[PDB]
């Protein structure tokens, strides 16, 4: 990654990079905006859009995709990065183009799909979808959403909030939430969303913050570990995160804590 980040050493990916682990042989899906395939620092292996009115998955009208992509490499950088266009521009998207999406990911063998995207109200078709990818292997993690709290109530969004997705909030650099990071028991883990630099469409690089930022370091980190550990299930990575993080505080607000890729992969 050609912009620095603070996420990176934040969540020990670099102790992995040492042992010589950096996500090789591992399939990530990216179901976001697209990615700008033309980044000088961004490989794409392969992709597809959903979008009808955007139906390029190797651009990014939105600027999202293409960060978040950026992320995952930072953390992961022998990952493979697969575009699946299932917003438009403005960040939003129908439910099918998302069913199609992650059915597009699991007839490609993905390992891995991150989704930093959050419904308020979520869809049954998604949910069904989404628990058809975990059934058949695939680690699935999502942005846990932007909506800060709401007294009591849990402010996760879909799909993070479904149990069979990790749901990732977001820290800043002091390990603190960030005033956005939505809050509730479906909330897993957290990793560093505010001011993360990375990589722009039209080979540009800029800070972004939001839980959206975070679930990139969660997918690189799974990459980092199926790397380490490429007979491990997704039920195995998932643990190992979940286990091992780095508590921060109560859960409705931190959930298990701060993910520690080196502990998650010994
Ligand atoms: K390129
Ligand atoms: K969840
Ligand atoms: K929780």
Redesign the pocket.
């Known amino acids: 990654a050609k912009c620095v980040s603070y996420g990176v050493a934040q969540i020990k990916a670099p102790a992995l990079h040492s042992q010589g682990y950096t996500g090789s042989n591992v399939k990530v899906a990216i179901l976001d905006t697209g990615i700008d395939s033309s980044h000088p620092d961004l490989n794409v292996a392969g992709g597809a859009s959903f979008v009808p009115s955007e139906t390029n998955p190797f651009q990014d009208n939105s600027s999202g995709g293409t960060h978040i992509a950026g992320t995952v490499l930072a953390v992961a950088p022998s990952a493979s990065l697969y575009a699946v266009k299932v917003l438009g521009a403005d960040g939003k998207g129908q439910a099918s183009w998302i069913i199609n999406g992650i059915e597009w990911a699991i007839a490609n063998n993905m390992d891995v799909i991150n989704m930093s995207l959050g419904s308020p109200s979520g869809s049954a078709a998604v949910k069904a979808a989404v628990d058809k990818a975990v059934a058949s292997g695939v680690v699935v993690v ?1 942005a ?1 959403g932007n909506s800060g709290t709401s007294g009591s109530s849990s402010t ?1 969004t879909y799909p ?8 990732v909030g977001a820290v800043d650099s002091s390990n603190q939430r960030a005033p956005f990071s939505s809050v509730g028991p ?3 883990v957290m990793a560093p969303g505010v001011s993360i630099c990375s990589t722009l469409p039209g080979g540009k690089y800029g800070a972004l913050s939001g839980t959206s930022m975070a679930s990139p370091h969660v997918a690189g980190a799974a990459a980092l570990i199926l790397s380490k550990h490429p007979n491990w299930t997704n039920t195995q990575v998932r643990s190992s995160l979940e286990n091992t993080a780095t508590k921060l505080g109560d859960s409705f607000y931190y959930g298990k804590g701060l993910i520690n890729v080196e502990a998650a992969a010994q």
């Not at 993070?160 to 749901?167: D, E, F, M």
């Open positions: 999502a846990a996760v993070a909030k479904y149990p069979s997705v990790i749901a479906e909330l897993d």
